[PDB]
Design a protein around this ligand. Structure first.
Ligand code: MG
Ligand code: MG
Ligand code: MG
Ligand code: MG
Ligand code: MG
Ligand code: MG
Ligand code: MG
Ligand code: MG
Ligand code: MG
Ligand code: MG
Ligand code: MG
Ligand code: MG
Ligand code: MG
Ligand code: MG
Ligand code: MG
Ligand code: MG
Ligand code: MG
Ligand code: MG
Ligand code: MG
Ligand code: MG
Ligand code: MG
Ligand code: MG
Ligand code: MG
Ligand code: MG
Ligand code: MG
Ligand code: MG
Ligand code: MG
Ligand code: MG
Ligand code: MG
Ligand code: MG
Ligand code: MG
Ligand code: MG
Ligand code: MG
Ligand code: MG
Ligand code: MG
Ligand code: MG
Ligand code: MG
Ligand code: MG
Ligand code: MG
Ligand code: MG
Ligand code: MG
Ligand code: MG
Ligand code: MG
Ligand code: MG
Ligand code: MG
Ligand code: MG
Ligand code: MG
Ligand code: MG
Ligand code: MG
Ligand code: MG
Ligand code: MG
Ligand code: MG
Ligand code: MG
Ligand code: MG
Ligand code: MG
Lengths: 285, 48, 95, 119
RNA sequence: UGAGUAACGCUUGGGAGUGAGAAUCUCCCAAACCGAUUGACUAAGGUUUCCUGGACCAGGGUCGUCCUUCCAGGGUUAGUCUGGACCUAAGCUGAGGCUGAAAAGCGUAGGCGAUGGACAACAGGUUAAUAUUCCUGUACUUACAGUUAGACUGAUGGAGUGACAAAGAAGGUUUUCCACCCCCAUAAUUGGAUUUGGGGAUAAAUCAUAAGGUGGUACAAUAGGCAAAUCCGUUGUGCAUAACAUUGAGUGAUGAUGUCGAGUGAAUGAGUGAUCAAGUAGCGAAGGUGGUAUUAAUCAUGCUUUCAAGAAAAGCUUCUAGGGUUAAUCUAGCUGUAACCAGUACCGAGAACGAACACACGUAGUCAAGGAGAGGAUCCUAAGGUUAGCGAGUGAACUAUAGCCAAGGAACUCUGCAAAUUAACCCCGUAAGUUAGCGAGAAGGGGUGCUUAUGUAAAAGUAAGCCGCAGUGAAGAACGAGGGGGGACUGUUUAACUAAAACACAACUCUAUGCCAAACCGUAAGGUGAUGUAUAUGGGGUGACACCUGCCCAGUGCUGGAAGGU
RNA sequence: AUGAGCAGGUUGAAGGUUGAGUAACAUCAACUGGAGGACCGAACCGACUCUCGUUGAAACGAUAGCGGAUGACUUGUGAUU
């Protein structure tokens, strides 16, 4: 759920909204586990050459990266227990500090619906269909929610990692592999049989409805002001110049670097992963 | 007002110093010409 | 050892102020590359009485005879302030 | 033109006459400019004639002009004026002070003047 | 030539002296400004500009016997201060290696890199110039050797700590402050004086005591911590109003028969005298009690709340490994030895720095007095500091800065531009509209001085009386109402003519992107995106909120498409 | 990347506690709590207006007003395009 903010500061009006962080998190305080805590260096949208590469990036607050076990393969056959659900500033989804039977601690992406004290276990056998259990895709019955999908087998988690992200199983293929996966955005892909994934939907399903109320909140989040192309000079942007508010003028909108970019497809179809795609959110292949 | 030159003992030595000029091929070429002109102040290191 | 680190004794108002009242303080000029331990060793091997402690001064070169047709810089000095124990006073000249 | 000097304000003028009158009463001679000597004479003569009765009212009146000098304070200058200087001028019908002109200053060419008590 | 013209860039009077010559130099007395500063300590920078004596070629917007100028001599003392010999952040360099016509670019291990972390000294005195550095007094820290006693020692590795955000409010203890008291000098010819003025201090370190703050404590099993573990982590049990562990401002005793101290105050010698000498040497009394409903500092890296979720390493503790067993190592005590390198002067700015100028500009941090006052606002001063490096006259026109102006009160002008009214505190009262938060200090009014009494811890207030034309009597404090255009708003912008309706902003929508993702820097390696995964990223357009967004797919752009023609 | 600064004074949100109330909610009253791209106003930042200056004190300032002043804030040091 979400909770409104009543500023009552007589400088404009903003119906700001924030996540509750009280009935969804165990302890409201910020007490991350020290061992699995590395600091992140803010690149600021600049590459190794020091030149701005991705615009509108810079000015976020200092954060410390929480080491997340996306692989979840090292401590197989060992029962793990969730102890507390906390807030990770580097991802929209909550992270759970789980502890294994041998005494090892780790952070994993928290499935929605689990509370403190719910047992977890990952391995490469049938196991059980319980929320958070991670097993390979060969044994998942068709229809269940799965997140943290692994593209390369024995690799780490890559698909369905954001808040409220999930995927459905849509049967198999006659090849004996490439289990069918219906992902978000209405795309159907063929994932290898040995690929390992975790069932359950990712927590924080209400991250869509959060409403920023101020420029400063977005600036502190790490977003710099984006200047429209219509306000530019005739140099530095195709949509510049003019005397007053001027239209596009060209045959179609253009990028700052001068490509069409509007409706054109920018996917390299001669890729080894094209044959594993059934639909591309619009049509066949 | 804040004028252009704000003196700093470190910035000057680390930008126009002898070791700074002796770190790139371009720096060696500039030093060669200044030796050719027989400048008494070859670099900013020899301030005194 | 070689004893090139004892160049010249110097006598000023400050030197004579220290060089009276029980413990004597003798101020020499030493090799600018020499260290305190070398100064104590040189004093040991050429006088015979162990210094109680040694203090060092570095006087930076400065412009002298400014405005004269040919201006010149000063010379780098390292000063050493030896202090002998109570009741002992040796002469800098006469051995 | 702005940030000008304060200038020869009325307060400055009153203080200048006050300072000069205290000194000429203490020592007996003042070497000043002629146009400044010609202005201290009025206050000097007025003070002396009012100080001829030597009552406490006259002391309060004189104290608005005297200032501290090197040779006397503000309280012995009172005694010096009222017991030594003023009693001497007991029947002189005015004109106790004289201003005479010296030469020009070397660095200003202004006309100097000596103000003295005429015995 | 202009022309001896403009200008000489914010600060007065006098006495005595030097000198060939003095508004300008020295001394003294005043006077006027600064006093959240023109005062004091330093970082950066400057680089001898610091002290003494001498000089008046040149420089000083005048003068000069004088100077931050010149000449000669002198001046900067560290085991504990600021930095290395310790550690890392952004970043730089980078053997191999990758990439590239060449030069070179990227980059691993290593190595540098403070504006951060760890680390032992305080008080007073002394020279013309240095002082946590020299001296006196009292301490502390780290190494090495010998010795005594005890103990098995335990890292290049593991673990814990180190280790941290913003805002806010309560406490504990010292303070500031108030009252009393102690000590010192003073007793006043201008009317009355029975008083007036000043001071009341001591550190680091050692020992004991500590208000409190922080977090559960032991025992037992262990498969996890590149091997090992008795340490950590995990799982159980017992006891858990507490115990145990760690930390802790302050207090008392030594340090201190010391030092400092208001004031008193010479001798010696110079000199014609005064005066210097000097208000210097020396002497130097008291050096305390209670309160606080007032103050700031510390405990405090304490606590609470919120989301924007808040450095690394060294070091310290611990664990085994590994080494010892007829030993090494460590701990505690005693004795002795040693503690390296660089900086230390002065200015720190209406004259030492950045602005060519002894230029009205600019430059991090730290100490912050009294009265009234919420206040570091405002006026006057304290400690302290300066004499704005051209003066003297006159008081024409004219100019700048101010002050005032009878009657009218915007008639002026492109426009109430500018100027003027209001202004602090307390007590009444406060509309339309609205997103119900605001509007709003709305509008409109009243009181303020002094004395006595009552009130209180202090007040505020209340009642009576008195004076003036006027009583936050001076300084510092919002002019208001109504309608409309634009932008929702707070913000940003053309350094040096345009601050706005322009840009941005929260919000809406379209489009691309399934991860070796699209996009982007390069030639490539490499990298940003992102240590992110469609609730995510990039781009185009619109710009809170509310209601809406109509028709045209002919042309252009984009997507898809069987075959067929080129 | 690492540090530092914002004298002083007001307004009194969310939330929590208690009581009334509800069949139980909702709602109301008191107390606590101290949030705000909140308000007034110094240092600080900025530069909207008049006048002066335009061979200036100054190759962009002075006096008098003026906007922000806990934040999209200001600033020191170091690195980098
Ligand atoms: Mg770490
Ligand atoms: Mg963007
Ligand atoms: Mg434009
Ligand atoms: Mg173009
Ligand atoms: Mg156009
Ligand atoms: Mg048009
Ligand atoms: Mg030294
Ligand atoms: Mg006046
Ligand atoms: Mg000519
Ligand atoms: Mg001429
Ligand atoms: Mg003429
Ligand atoms: Mg003329
Ligand atoms: Mg003139
Ligand atoms: Mg002047
Ligand atoms: Mg003058
Ligand atoms: Mg004053
Ligand atoms: Mg100052
Ligand atoms: Mg010089
Ligand atoms: Mg001097
Ligand atoms: Mg001299
Ligand atoms: Mg001259
Ligand atoms: Mg010492
Ligand atoms: Mg280093
Ligand atoms: Mg440092
Ligand atoms: Mg000094
Ligand atoms: Mg009397
Ligand atoms: Mg192991
Ligand atoms: Mg000093
Ligand atoms: Mg200045
Ligand atoms: Mg200068
Ligand atoms: Mg000047
Ligand atoms: Mg400063
Ligand atoms: Mg004050
Ligand atoms: Mg003031
Ligand atoms: Mg009037
Ligand atoms: Mg009048
Ligand atoms: Mg009138
Ligand atoms: Mg009228
Ligand atoms: Mg007209
Ligand atoms: Mg008209
Ligand atoms: Mg106006
Ligand atoms: Mg209104
Ligand atoms: Mg209209
Ligand atoms: Mg606007
Ligand atoms: Mg604005
Ligand atoms: Mg401009
Ligand atoms: Mg402007
Ligand atoms: Mg590539
Ligand atoms: Mg990355
Ligand atoms: Mg974004
Ligand atoms: Mg627009
Ligand atoms: Mg619009
Ligand atoms: Mg068509
Ligand atoms: Mg087509
Ligand atoms: Mg505000």
């Amino acid at each position: 759920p979400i909770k409104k903010i009543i500023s009552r500061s007589n400088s404009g009006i903003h119906h700001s909204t924030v996540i509750d962080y009280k009935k969804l998190l165990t302890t409201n305080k910020n007490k991350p586990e020290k061992s699995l805590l590395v600091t992140l260096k803010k690149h600021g949208g600049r590459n190794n050459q020091g030149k701005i590469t991705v615009r509108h990036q810079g000015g976020r607050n200092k954060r410390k990266y929480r080491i997340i076990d996306f692989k979840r393969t090292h401590y197989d056959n060992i029962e793990a227990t969730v102890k507390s659900i906390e807030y990770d500033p580097n991802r929209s989804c909550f992270v759970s500090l789980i502890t294994y039977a041998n005494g090892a601690k780790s952070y994993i992406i928290s499935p929605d619906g689990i509370k403190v004290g719910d047992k977890i276990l990952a391995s490469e056998h049938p196991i059980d269909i319980k929320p958070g259990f991670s097993m390979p895709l060969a044994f998942i019955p068709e229809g269940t929610q799965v997140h943290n999908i692994e593209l390369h087998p024995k690799g780490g988690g890559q698909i369905a990692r954001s808040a409220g992200s999930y995927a459905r199983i849509l049967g198999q293929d006659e090849t004996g592999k490439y289990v069918i996966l219906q992902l978000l955005s209405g795309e159907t892909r063929k994932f290898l049989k040995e690929c390992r994934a975790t069932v359950g939907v990712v927590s924080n399903l209400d991250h869509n409805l959060v409403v920023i109320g101020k420029a400063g909140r977005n600036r502190h989040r790490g977003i710099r002001p984006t200047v429209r192309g219509s306000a530019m000079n005739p140099n530095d942007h195709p949509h510049g110049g003019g005397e007053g508010r001027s239209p596009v003028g060209r045959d179609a909108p253009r990028t700052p670097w001068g490509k069409r970019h509007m409706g054109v497809k920018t996917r390299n179809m001669k890729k080894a992963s094209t044959n594993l795609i059934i639909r591309n959110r619009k049509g066949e292949q | 007002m804040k004028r252009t030159y704000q003196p700093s003992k470190l910035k000057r030595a680390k930008t126009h110093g002898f070791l700074a000029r002796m770190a790139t091929a371009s720096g060696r070429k500039v030093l060669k010409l200044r030796r050719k002109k027989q400048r008494a102040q070859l670099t900013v290191s020899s301030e005194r | 050892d070689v004893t090139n680190v004892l160049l010249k004794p110097v006598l000023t108002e400050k030197v004579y102020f220290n060089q009276m009242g029980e413990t004597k303080k003798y101020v020499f000029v030493v090799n600018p590359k020499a260290s305190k331990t070398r100064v104590k060793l040189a004093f040991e091997l050429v006088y015979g009485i162990k210094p109680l402690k040694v203090n060092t001064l570095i006087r930076k070169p400065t412009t002298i005879r400014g405005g004269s047709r040919f201006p010149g810089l000063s010379k780098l000095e390292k000063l050493a302030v030896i202090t002998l124990p109570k009741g002992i006073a040796i002469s800098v000249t006469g051995e | 033109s702005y940030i000008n000097k304060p200038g020869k304000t009325s307060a400055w003028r009153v203080m200048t006459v006050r300072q000069q009158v205290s000194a000429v009463l203490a020592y007996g001679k003042i070497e000043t400019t002629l146009k400044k000597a010609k202005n201290t004479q009025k206050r000097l003569d007025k003070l002396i004639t009012l100080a001829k009765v030597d009552n406490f009212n006259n002391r309060r009146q004189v104290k608005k002009w005297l200032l501290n000098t090197n040779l006397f304070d503000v309280d012995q200058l009172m005694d010096h004026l009222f017991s030594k200087v003023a009693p001497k001028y007991e029947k002189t019908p005015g004109g106790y002070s004289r201003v005479l002109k010296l030469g020009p200053r070397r660095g200003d060419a202004t006309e100097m003047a000596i103000l003295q008590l005429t015995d």
